[PDB]
């Protein structure tokens, strides 16, 4: 779902744009990951697990 800004008057005089950020925007392999790299943005481990 790439974003096409028209830039010039004629055909193809345009570009592409993309973007992604949300809760699950931690370290991204192809998906974020499973038990890691998703919660770290979404659910911190700072419950007790550092103790």
């Amino acid at each position: 779902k790439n974003l096409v800004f028209q830039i010039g008057a004629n055909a193809t005089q345009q570009i592409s744009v993309n973007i992604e950020d949300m809760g699950a925007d931690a370290l991204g392999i192809k998906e974020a990951d499973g038990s890691i790299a998703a919660l770290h943005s979404v659910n911190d481990l700072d419950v007790t697990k550092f103790a």
Binding site: L3, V4, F5, Q6, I7, A9, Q14, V17
Partner: protein
């Protein structure tokens, strides 16, 4: 001679008349061209507003 003379002036009148017919059609097509210009503008603007 006279036949071809008066016939010739009449033919010239006929020609001018043809010109003015062309003037009408040309004005219609002028305006059509303005429309199509506006259309193209809306197409370009539509192009970026695909995003």
């Amino acid at each position: 001679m006279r036949g071809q003379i008066r016939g010739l002036e009449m033919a010239s009148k006929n020609s001018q008349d043809g010109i003015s017919l062309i003037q009408t059609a040309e004005g219609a097509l002028t305006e059509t061209r303005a429309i199509l210009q506006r259309v193209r503008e809306l197409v370009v603007q539509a192009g970026n507003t695909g995003t």
